[PDB]
Design an enzyme around this catalytic site. Structure first.
Site, PDB file in Angstrom:
ATOM      1  N   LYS A  86       0.880  -1.160   0.000  1.00  0.00           N
ATOM      2  CA  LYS A  86       0.000   0.000   0.000  1.00  0.00           C
ATOM      3  C   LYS A  86       0.913   1.204   0.000  1.00  0.00           C
ATOM      4  O   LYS A  86       1.177   1.812   1.038  1.00  0.00           O
ATOM      5  CB  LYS A  86      -0.907   0.042   1.237  1.00  0.00           C
ATOM      6  CG  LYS A  86      -2.118   0.939   1.006  1.00  0.00           C
ATOM      7  CD  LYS A  86      -2.944   1.256   2.265  1.00  0.00           C
ATOM      8  CE  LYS A  86      -3.328  -0.001   3.066  1.00  0.00           C
ATOM      9  NZ  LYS A  86      -2.234  -0.399   4.016  1.00  0.00           N
ATOM     10  N   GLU A 140       4.071  -9.023 -13.366  1.00  0.00           N
ATOM     11  CA  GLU A 140       4.754 -10.254 -12.979  1.00  0.00           C
ATOM     12  C   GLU A 140       4.811 -10.141 -11.438  1.00  0.00           C
ATOM     13  O   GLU A 140       5.038  -9.053 -10.873  1.00  0.00           O
ATOM     14  CB  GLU A 140       6.184 -10.177 -13.554  1.00  0.00           C
ATOM     15  CG  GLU A 140       7.078 -11.256 -13.122  1.00  0.00           C
ATOM     16  CD  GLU A 140       8.373 -11.253 -13.843  1.00  0.00           C
ATOM     17  OE1 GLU A 140       9.076 -12.232 -13.710  1.00  0.00           O
ATOM     18  OE2 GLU A 140       8.698 -10.287 -14.527  1.00  0.00           O
ATOM     19  N   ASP A 158      16.153   5.156 -11.437  1.00  0.00           N
ATOM     20  CA  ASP A 158      15.916   4.974  -9.994  1.00  0.00           C
ATOM     21  C   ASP A 158      16.477   3.625  -9.447  1.00  0.00           C
ATOM     22  O   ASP A 158      15.789   2.825  -8.748  1.00  0.00           O
ATOM     23  CB  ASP A 158      14.427   5.166  -9.702  1.00  0.00           C
ATOM     24  CG  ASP A 158      14.167   5.615  -8.266  1.00  0.00           C
ATOM     25  OD1 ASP A 158      15.092   6.094  -7.592  1.00  0.00           O
ATOM     26  OD2 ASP A 158      13.017   5.469  -7.828  1.00  0.00           O
TER      27      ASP A 158
END
Length: 290
Positions: free
Chosen positions: A24, A92, A136
């Site tokens: 989350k 995936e 990143d």
């Protein structure tokens, strides 16, 4: 304008079955679930579109880049579906957690560090050959399957150095792991990813990147100002040298991902990836407490 997108007639609540909530973040939530059609596990990322604004442009960017990659080193993207104001992104599933999660229980030994770095270098090499930049690279963005396979994820801000744009200038990434030329918004390319990899090598060995306790704004002037970070502590000479090779302030002096694959640290310590299941279980035991 999103590859893989399905009209509203594809009801994701009927096509997929959520098994459990596994994340989350701040874009929405992530579930482990099943494609009922092909009966195979997938990761399901749901973002509320009527409740997100500027983040949409980054989500579409990510999906576009993931749609163009086909490598066992880069998380696969299966498509997107729309439900009311919810975008469901099918990906995936990698149940072993991230390299950052595998650090939670304690340090990695050099064999584990080398194994994880070798696989990341494989993904970088694919991307760089495809003229893509991750942008990143850090331990939270390196994911593992439950049997130890290692993949690059969350490009989000991944760049594309195509034909008429040989260089990128965009100030993007997470400060601690950003190359000096990226901060200075100089023209940059795949070498920004090699710097990030060097910072991630320190992160897998010490648990955090250099300057991790300073405020981000200070770090904005330290990286271009200061000498490159070095790995301090009791690590082998080749590990410290691998880190130095990556962390050159001059980007054109950093080696390619392909050459780092022959580095002595990698050659002497990396082992098959299945050896990583141990590290993966340690994490399960650990999180079971908590």
């Amino acid at each position: 304008g999103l590859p893989g997108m399905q009209n509203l007639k594809a009801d994701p609540e009927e096509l997929f079955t959520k098994l459990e909530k596994i994340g989350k973040g701040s874009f929405g939530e992530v579930f482990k679930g099943i494609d009922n059609r092909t009966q195979k596990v997938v990761a399901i990322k749901i973002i509320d579109l009527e409740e997100a604004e500027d983040e949409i442009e980054d989500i579409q960017q990510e999906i576009t880049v993931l749609s163009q990659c086909d490598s066992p080193y880069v998380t696969k993207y299966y498509g997107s579906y729309l439900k009311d104001t919810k975008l469901w992104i099918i990906m995936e599933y990698l149940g072993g957690g991230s390299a950052l999660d595998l650090l939670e229980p304690g340090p990695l030994d050099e064999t584990q560090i080398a194994t994880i770095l070798r696989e990341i270098l494989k993904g970088l090499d694919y991307l760089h050959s495809e003229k893509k930049i991750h942008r990143d690279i850090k331990a939270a963005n390196v994911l593992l399957s439950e049997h130890g396979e290692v993949k690059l994820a969350d490009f989000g801000v991944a760049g594309q150095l195509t034909d008429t744009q040989i260089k990128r200038n965009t100030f993007v990434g997470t400060p601690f792991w950003m190359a000096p030329e990226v901060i200075k918004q100089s023209a940059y390319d795949s070498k920004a990813d090699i710097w990030s990899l060097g910072i991630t090598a320190i992160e897998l060995a010490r648990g955090e990147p250099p300057h991790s306790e300073l405020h981000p704004m200070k770090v904005l002037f330290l990286i271009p100002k200061n000498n490159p970070p070095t790995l301090e502590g009791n690590y082998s000479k080749p590990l410290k040298e691998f880190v130095e090779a990556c962390l050159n302030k001059e980007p054109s002096f950093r080696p390619t991902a392909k050459e780092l694959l022959k580095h002595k640290f990698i050659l002497r310590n990396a082992k098959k990836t299945s050896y990583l299941t141990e590290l993966i279980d340690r994490y399960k035991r650990w999180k079971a407490e908590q």
